[PDB]
Structures are given as structure tokens and as C-alpha cells.
Amino acid sequence: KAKVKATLGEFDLRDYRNVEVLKRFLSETGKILPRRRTGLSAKEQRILAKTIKRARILGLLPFTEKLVRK
Amino acid sequence: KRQVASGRAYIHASYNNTIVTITDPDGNPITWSSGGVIGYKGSRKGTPYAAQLAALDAAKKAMAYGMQSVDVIVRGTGAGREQAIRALQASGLQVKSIVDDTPVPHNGCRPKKKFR
Amino acid sequence: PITKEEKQKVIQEFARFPGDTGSTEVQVALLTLRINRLSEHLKVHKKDHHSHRGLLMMVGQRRRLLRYLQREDPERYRALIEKLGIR
Amino acid sequence: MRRYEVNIVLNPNLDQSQLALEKEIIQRALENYGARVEKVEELGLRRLAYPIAKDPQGYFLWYQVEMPEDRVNDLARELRIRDNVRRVMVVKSQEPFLANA
RNA sequence: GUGGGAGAGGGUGGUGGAAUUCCCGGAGUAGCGGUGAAAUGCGCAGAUACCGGGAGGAACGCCGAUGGCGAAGGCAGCCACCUGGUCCACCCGUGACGCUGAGGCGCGAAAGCGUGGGGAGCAAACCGGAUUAGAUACCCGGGUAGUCCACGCCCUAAACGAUGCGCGCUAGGUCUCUGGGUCUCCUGGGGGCCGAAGCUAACGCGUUAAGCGCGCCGCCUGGGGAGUACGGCCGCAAGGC
Ligand SMILES: [Mg+2]
Ligand SMILES: [Mg+2]
Ligand SMILES: [Mg+2]
Ligand SMILES: [Mg+2]
Ligand SMILES: [Mg+2]
Ligand SMILES: [Mg+2]
Ligand SMILES: [Mg+2]
Ligand SMILES: [Mg+2]
Ligand SMILES: [Mg+2]
Ligand SMILES: [Mg+2]
Ligand SMILES: [Mg+2]
Ligand SMILES: [Mg+2]
Ligand SMILES: [Mg+2]
Ligand SMILES: [Mg+2]
Ligand SMILES: [Mg+2]
Ligand SMILES: [Mg+2]
Ligand SMILES: [Mg+2]
Ligand SMILES: [Mg+2]
Ligand SMILES: [Mg+2]
Ligand SMILES: [Mg+2]
Ligand SMILES: [Mg+2]
Ligand SMILES: [Mg+2]
Ligand SMILES: [Mg+2]
Ligand SMILES: [Mg+2]
Ligand SMILES: [Mg+2]
Ligand SMILES: [Mg+2]
Ligand SMILES: [Mg+2]
Ligand SMILES: [Mg+2]
Ligand SMILES: [Mg+2]
Ligand SMILES: [Mg+2]
Ligand SMILES: [Mg+2]
Ligand SMILES: [Mg+2]
Ligand SMILES: [Mg+2]
Ligand SMILES: [Mg+2]
Ligand SMILES: [Mg+2]
Ligand SMILES: [Mg+2]
């Protein structure tokens, strides 16, 4: 399976307003994806998590979602 | 006396009981059933067969209301949490989609001693 | 907090000669600056205990440096103490 | 004076009089607290991920400013007191940490 | 000193969503809950389930790790402000200014105390239902203090790495966090795992020493009696030394 960073450009991990790329790092639900599927380093993941929470509080990223086909 | 022709179906399954509430596309309920609505009384209500019978009874009451297309919402976990959906699929109601909306907190409340 | 403007102001004020950075005089001056900053931070925020431990350590270091200065040259020690208003 | 980024999400349904009024009130708040406005980006209508104040959409504003530090919280409060302003997040500016460089 | 860096380090104020409970409303019948079975309990004054709205308290899912920070206790949503510690590079400044530390002083999980707030959920005591030869327990239903906050006390612990602090010396390999570098790698500084020499009663330790040395502090001298008695000190008390 493909990791998120493998298929992506040279993007800003500190931009909480870019929903297009931050949506890639969320799961089918609103959960943040683990490093196994994001292909990020520890520092990169640590920054991404905080930017994702920032975007969430601004109503740009979903706090949680609903699972399908279950 | 409603002629709803379409709606939602919520399956609340626990380890002590499984209940099915068939509702309309904007949230209000139409009919419902459970393991106690049907004959079973005690722990018998938590078996998958009771969940199947409850789903089928609720689906037939929906037929009495005139239900054809059904969207499924699932909350909880227990024996027959899947058997309810299986019977609901083979009940004669065209299943639109299945959704698991089990409410999980963000670590808000302190559980009972059983749950720690 | 303490930006480079204030820091360099104090350093150029307490230098033994142009270019000096780590003289005992300059060390005690910068120490006393951070001491006063923290002690004013601890006038409010009486429940900040870890910063209070940091203040204890800063006091200890400043006192050690002043003891050394007093042991080596008493006159420069008096000058420093009078210039900073300590002890 | 440090560099900050003010995000403002307010009611989308406003017309031009109301929107210009709220925007000029934000401007007056920035003036009164010593906020030098370096740049501005107005996104406007956007689809929220979750409903905010019973509304599925919101109107967005982003201001990069330079203002004194001890006034940031009071400025945030004064910005929040307005009814139509539903979200205020003041963020200290930072450098663009990149990935997959 | 300069210039960079990582962080649930601390304090203050703000702020977000999920969930529980409760209240208002809509729609909707006959049970829900709970257990190994059950019963107390709740439900026709309309519950449970579903939908919308409101209130309030407490805690922060995914990220999260075998991770990080702190002297220890301990510290996880987000934002801002105040502030501590620490690491690296530059080789710039002072010129032994160092190490330890009886006493003292400060900090010190939880529970507990006092005054005043707060109170969703949980829950000693307690009230019931079961189980049993009996049930004063485990299991179920309730439920107060408390848990939360402000301020002042309390000074205990498996307060654990059961390993005091500092420095130097003594094979490496592997995983990792964070810096620098001419960036298959090297070089620092933290977190683990194997294992040289050596150590150990053995288990095991092994550049994060329990190895080889040095300095300083604390403590030990058979078990029970007993962390008891007396005395002193501290404490509102419980009680602690
Ligand atoms: Mg049952
Ligand atoms: Mg507002
Ligand atoms: Mg912190
Ligand atoms: Mg903090
Ligand atoms: Mg009602
Ligand atoms: Mg009744
Ligand atoms: Mg009754
Ligand atoms: Mg009654
Ligand atoms: Mg209340
Ligand atoms: Mg986890
Ligand atoms: Mg700092
Ligand atoms: Mg030199
Ligand atoms: Mg010289
Ligand atoms: Mg010492
Ligand atoms: Mg001592
Ligand atoms: Mg204590
Ligand atoms: Mg306590
Ligand atoms: Mg109390
Ligand atoms: Mg309870
Ligand atoms: Mg109980
Ligand atoms: Mg009995
Ligand atoms: Mg020793
Ligand atoms: Mg590198
Ligand atoms: Mg450490
Ligand atoms: Mg190492
Ligand atoms: Mg050997
Ligand atoms: Mg070993
Ligand atoms: Mg050693
Ligand atoms: Mg030994
Ligand atoms: Mg003793
Ligand atoms: Mg004896
Ligand atoms: Mg005792
Ligand atoms: Mg005696
Ligand atoms: Mg006594
Ligand atoms: Mg007395
Ligand atoms: Mg005792």
C-alpha cells in the first residue's frame, strides 16, 4: 500500500489552512493516520498532528466521521 | 397511516439486548422492536437469534407502514450485532447503505469499575 | 523576556574592556538581570515552583561568582555590588 | 511587536452592508490595539467539516499582522465579543517547515 | 558570549469537539436495564430507542510509541502570554571560579483536614437485590463524604532502576529520539536491547556498571517483640519525624 508522503508534493506541514493536503492524512474516519500509513518521520508527524488539530478547530477538518459498509 | 416509503433503521446492540428502531429520513421513529418485545425475557434477549427476530419484527411493522428503501445505522457491540443486519438485509427491505456510528467519547467521563 | 537589545545593552555596560563577554562582572550582571526578571515573575504566579527552583540555582551561581570575586579582588567586588545594589 | 496570524470565521449569510460593517469593526479593533496589518487574505464562503452555530458553512478571513504581545489576548477578546464572529484563532507566525523536500 | 534546536517542564488566562447526565420539544409503544442465571430498580404521570434544542461538570479519542520533558513527585485537546531546565555548533570571553554536602530551607502521588465554592460521571460509608451452609465479600441496582476549584495544612508510599551525587578509565553490535557534519556514514547528547574484559552467592550487571579507581553524604550489624513504648519536636486533627 502507498504511504501518504510517497504520493505528494513539496508541501507545508505547518499550513493549517490547506485542507486539500491535510485531508490526505486523515483516515476514512476523522482519525489521524499512524506513521505506518503516513510514511512520516517522528518530527514530521508531531508537526502534522498539531496542524491537523488547528485545522479541526477552524472547522476545516472533521473531528470525527462515520464508518461505511460495516 | 403514514406511507413513508423510505427511511432509516438504527440497530442498538449491547451484551444484554439488541433493539431496532425504524425511523423516517428526518429522524423521527416509525416502529421498533427488541429481544424483550419478542418472547425472550432474560439473557436470552442478547442472543443473535433474538436480534434476528427483533430486526424481522421491526421490518414487518415497517412493511405495515409501507417501507421499501432503508438506510442502516449501527451503534454498539454484542452478540447478534451483525445478525440483525443480516436479517435486515434478507427481510425484504432493499438496504441502501450500512453505517457504524457507535458513539465513542474523547476520554471525558470516568467509567464504572466494571469498565476499567 | 530578555531580547538581544537589552542583553547587549547590559553586556556593553558591564564589560571590563571592549569585546569582553564572559567577565565575572558581566556574568553577575546578566545573572542579576535574569534574577530580577524571575523574581518579578514570582511576585505573581506564586504557584510556579519549578521556575522558583531555577531562581534558586541562579541565586546560587551568582553568590558563588560574587564569593570568588571577593576572594580575588575586593575593590572590583565592591564596585560591582554597589553598581548592582546587592547584599 | 511580534508577527501573528488572525483567522476569523463569521456568519456566511451576511449581505454587503452587514459584511462591510463587521469587517470595518475588525479593522477598528486592529487599529485600537496597535496591530500593523502586513497582509490580508479573504477566502469567504467555505464548506465546513462540521456545523458551526447551526450553519454548515462559514465566511473566512486571514490577517498577517505585527502587534505588541501583551495586547494579543485583549484583542482576541474584543474580536470575540461580536455576535456574528463565530471563531477567532490568533496564532503566532512561524516559518514554513516543509516535507518531502 | 554568539547562533541554532527539541520537548505532556511549570504558571496564568482564553478556547474546541466527542461522550455521560439532566431539562425543553417532536415523533413513537411495552418494556428497558442487568446477570452464570436472576431480582432490587426504572417505565402508562409515556420509559428505553430515534431526532432537534438547551444547561452543567469533569476528562482530552485518533496522533501515541517499546516516544518525549522534569531533580523527584510527576507532566497529554488547541491558542496566547509569563517562565525554568537542557542540547549542539562556533573556539570568542573569565581564568580553578570546582565536587560533595551534617543542619537549615523549599518542593513533595494519592488519601486525609480547615474555610469557601462546585458537583455531570464515578464512588469509601451506607441503603437495598442476589449468591452461599452463613455473605458483614466478590456480582447487580442506588447512594454520601470525596473526586473538581481557590486558599491554608498534612510530609507519608512498592516516593522503585528496591541501584546517592560527581569525575576519569575499560571491545563492540543492534533499534531509537534530538542536533551538527565533507550526510553507504561519521560525530555529540538522551532512551532501550544483546554482549568483551571484569564483577556477582547466583539471578544477572556489563561506556545508562552492579567493572577499574577517587572524593563526599546517607544507611546496615540475626528474627520476633516493633516502627511498639517513653521522651522530645511538628500538626487543627488524623498522625508524622
Ligand atoms: Mg438482558
Ligand atoms: Mg462570537
Ligand atoms: Mg507543556
Ligand atoms: Mg503548560
Ligand atoms: Mg421526551
Ligand atoms: Mg409505573
Ligand atoms: Mg413499577
Ligand atoms: Mg410509579
Ligand atoms: Mg446542574
Ligand atoms: Mg495509545
Ligand atoms: Mg524555554
Ligand atoms: Mg580560548
Ligand atoms: Mg588571559
Ligand atoms: Mg549540589
Ligand atoms: Mg539536606
Ligand atoms: Mg503531599
Ligand atoms: Mg489530594
Ligand atoms: Mg476539602
Ligand atoms: Mg454508579
Ligand atoms: Mg456499587
Ligand atoms: Mg442477603
Ligand atoms: Mg557507593
Ligand atoms: Mg543529519
Ligand atoms: Mg531524562
Ligand atoms: Mg548513546
Ligand atoms: Mg565472562
Ligand atoms: Mg543485559
Ligand atoms: Mg560510573
Ligand atoms: Mg553488588
Ligand atoms: Mg532507621
Ligand atoms: Mg533481637
Ligand atoms: Mg507508620
Ligand atoms: Mg527513654
Ligand atoms: Mg509522642
Ligand atoms: Mg500539640
Ligand atoms: Mg498510620
PDB file of N, CA, C and O in Angstrom, chain D residues 18-41:
ATOM      1  N   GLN D  18     -23.904  44.562   6.100  1.00  0.00           N
ATOM      2  CA  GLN D  18     -23.508  43.860   7.318  1.00  0.00           C
ATOM      3  C   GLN D  18     -22.064  43.379   7.246  1.00  0.00           C
ATOM      4  O   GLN D  18     -21.316  43.480   8.227  1.00  0.00           O
ATOM      5  N   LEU D  19     -21.658  42.838   6.098  1.00  0.00           N
ATOM      6  CA  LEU D  19     -20.306  42.304   5.974  1.00  0.00           C
ATOM      7  C   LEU D  19     -19.271  43.418   6.058  1.00  0.00           C
ATOM      8  O   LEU D  19     -18.262  43.291   6.762  1.00  0.00           O
ATOM      9  N   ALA D  20     -19.508  44.523   5.347  1.00  0.00           N
ATOM     10  CA  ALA D  20     -18.595  45.658   5.429  1.00  0.00           C
ATOM     11  C   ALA D  20     -18.565  46.237   6.837  1.00  0.00           C
ATOM     12  O   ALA D  20     -17.509  46.661   7.316  1.00  0.00           O
ATOM     13  N   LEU D  21     -19.715  46.258   7.518  1.00  0.00           N
ATOM     14  CA  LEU D  21     -19.766  46.735   8.898  1.00  0.00           C
ATOM     15  C   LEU D  21     -18.892  45.882   9.808  1.00  0.00           C
ATOM     16  O   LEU D  21     -18.061  46.405  10.560  1.00  0.00           O
ATOM     17  N   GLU D  22     -19.081  44.561   9.766  1.00  0.00           N
ATOM     18  CA  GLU D  22     -18.286  43.672  10.608  1.00  0.00           C
ATOM     19  C   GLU D  22     -16.801  43.774  10.276  1.00  0.00           C
ATOM     20  O   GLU D  22     -15.949  43.759  11.174  1.00  0.00           O
ATOM     21  N   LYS D  23     -16.472  43.894   8.987  1.00  0.00           N
ATOM     22  CA  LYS D  23     -15.072  43.983   8.588  1.00  0.00           C
ATOM     23  C   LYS D  23     -14.442  45.285   9.068  1.00  0.00           C
ATOM     24  O   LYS D  23     -13.299  45.291   9.540  1.00  0.00           O
ATOM     25  N   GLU D  24     -15.177  46.396   8.980  1.00  0.00           N
ATOM     26  CA  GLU D  24     -14.650  47.661   9.480  1.00  0.00           C
ATOM     27  C   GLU D  24     -14.560  47.662  11.003  1.00  0.00           C
ATOM     28  O   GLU D  24     -13.686  48.329  11.566  1.00  0.00           O
ATOM     29  N   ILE D  25     -15.435  46.920  11.685  1.00  0.00           N
ATOM     30  CA  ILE D  25     -15.317  46.793  13.135  1.00  0.00           C
ATOM     31  C   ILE D  25     -14.052  46.024  13.497  1.00  0.00           C
ATOM     32  O   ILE D  25     -13.330  46.387  14.435  1.00  0.00           O
ATOM     33  N   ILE D  26     -13.762  44.953  12.755  1.00  0.00           N
ATOM     34  CA  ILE D  26     -12.498  44.242  12.939  1.00  0.00           C
ATOM     35  C   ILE D  26     -11.319  45.175  12.681  1.00  0.00           C
ATOM     36  O   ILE D  26     -10.314  45.147  13.403  1.00  0.00           O
ATOM     37  N   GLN D  27     -11.425  46.015  11.648  1.00  0.00           N
ATOM     38  CA  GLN D  27     -10.370  46.980  11.346  1.00  0.00           C
ATOM     39  C   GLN D  27     -10.158  47.950  12.503  1.00  0.00           C
ATOM     40  O   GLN D  27      -9.019  48.254  12.873  1.00  0.00           O
ATOM     41  N   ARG D  28     -11.250  48.471  13.063  1.00  0.00           N
ATOM     42  CA  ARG D  28     -11.144  49.402  14.182  1.00  0.00           C
ATOM     43  C   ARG D  28     -10.543  48.723  15.405  1.00  0.00           C
ATOM     44  O   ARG D  28      -9.777  49.341  16.154  1.00  0.00           O
ATOM     45  N   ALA D  29     -10.882  47.451  15.626  1.00  0.00           N
ATOM     46  CA  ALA D  29     -10.266  46.705  16.719  1.00  0.00           C
ATOM     47  C   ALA D  29      -8.767  46.543  16.497  1.00  0.00           C
ATOM     48  O   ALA D  29      -7.975  46.653  17.440  1.00  0.00           O
ATOM     49  N   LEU D  30      -8.361  46.277  15.253  1.00  0.00           N
ATOM     50  CA  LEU D  30      -6.937  46.173  14.944  1.00  0.00           C
ATOM     51  C   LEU D  30      -6.223  47.500  15.163  1.00  0.00           C
ATOM     52  O   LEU D  30      -5.093  47.532  15.666  1.00  0.00           O
ATOM     53  N   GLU D  31      -6.862  48.607  14.775  1.00  0.00           N
ATOM     54  CA  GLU D  31      -6.270  49.926  14.987  1.00  0.00           C
ATOM     55  C   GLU D  31      -6.115  50.226  16.472  1.00  0.00           C
ATOM     56  O   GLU D  31      -5.058  50.684  16.919  1.00  0.00           O
ATOM     57  N   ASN D  32      -7.169  49.975  17.251  1.00  0.00           N
ATOM     58  CA  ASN D  32      -7.201  50.393  18.647  1.00  0.00           C
ATOM     59  C   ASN D  32      -6.192  49.648  19.511  1.00  0.00           C
ATOM     60  O   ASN D  32      -5.839  50.139  20.588  1.00  0.00           O
ATOM     61  N   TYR D  33      -5.721  48.484  19.069  1.00  0.00           N
ATOM     62  CA  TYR D  33      -4.774  47.688  19.838  1.00  0.00           C
ATOM     63  C   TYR D  33      -3.369  47.722  19.251  1.00  0.00           C
ATOM     64  O   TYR D  33      -2.499  46.972  19.708  1.00  0.00           O
ATOM     65  N   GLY D  34      -3.124  48.573  18.260  1.00  0.00           N
ATOM     66  CA  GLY D  34      -1.796  48.708  17.691  1.00  0.00           C
ATOM     67  C   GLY D  34      -1.372  47.566  16.796  1.00  0.00           C
ATOM     68  O   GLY D  34      -0.231  47.098  16.893  1.00  0.00           O
ATOM     69  N   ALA D  35      -2.257  47.106  15.917  1.00  0.00           N
ATOM     70  CA  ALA D  35      -1.976  45.970  15.043  1.00  0.00           C
ATOM     71  C   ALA D  35      -1.662  46.497  13.649  1.00  0.00           C
ATOM     72  O   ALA D  35      -2.560  46.907  12.910  1.00  0.00           O
ATOM     73  N   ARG D  36      -0.382  46.484  13.291  1.00  0.00           N
ATOM     74  CA  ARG D  36       0.037  46.834  11.939  1.00  0.00           C
ATOM     75  C   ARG D  36      -0.286  45.675  11.001  1.00  0.00           C
ATOM     76  O   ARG D  36       0.215  44.561  11.185  1.00  0.00           O
ATOM     77  N   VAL D  37      -1.113  45.938   9.997  1.00  0.00           N
ATOM     78  CA  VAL D  37      -1.628  44.897   9.116  1.00  0.00           C
ATOM     79  C   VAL D  37      -0.624  44.701   7.989  1.00  0.00           C
ATOM     80  O   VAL D  37      -0.449  45.581   7.143  1.00  0.00           O
ATOM     81  N   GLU D  38       0.041  43.543   7.976  1.00  0.00           N
ATOM     82  CA  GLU D  38       1.022  43.275   6.930  1.00  0.00           C
ATOM     83  C   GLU D  38       0.366  42.744   5.661  1.00  0.00           C
ATOM     84  O   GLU D  38       0.725  43.170   4.558  1.00  0.00           O
ATOM     85  N   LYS D  39      -0.586  41.820   5.784  1.00  0.00           N
ATOM     86  CA  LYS D  39      -1.296  41.343   4.600  1.00  0.00           C
ATOM     87  C   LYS D  39      -2.620  40.710   5.009  1.00  0.00           C
ATOM     88  O   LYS D  39      -2.870  40.438   6.186  1.00  0.00           O
ATOM     89  N   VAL D  40      -3.461  40.461   4.003  1.00  0.00           N
ATOM     90  CA  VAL D  40      -4.838  40.022   4.203  1.00  0.00           C
ATOM     91  C   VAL D  40      -5.224  39.050   3.092  1.00  0.00           C
ATOM     92  O   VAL D  40      -4.884  39.259   1.924  1.00  0.00           O
ATOM     93  N   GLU D  41      -5.928  37.979   3.467  1.00  0.00           N
ATOM     94  CA  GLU D  41      -6.470  37.001   2.526  1.00  0.00           C
ATOM     95  C   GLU D  41      -7.897  36.674   2.940  1.00  0.00           C
ATOM     96  O   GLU D  41      -8.129  36.196   4.054  1.00  0.00           O
TER      97      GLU D  41
END
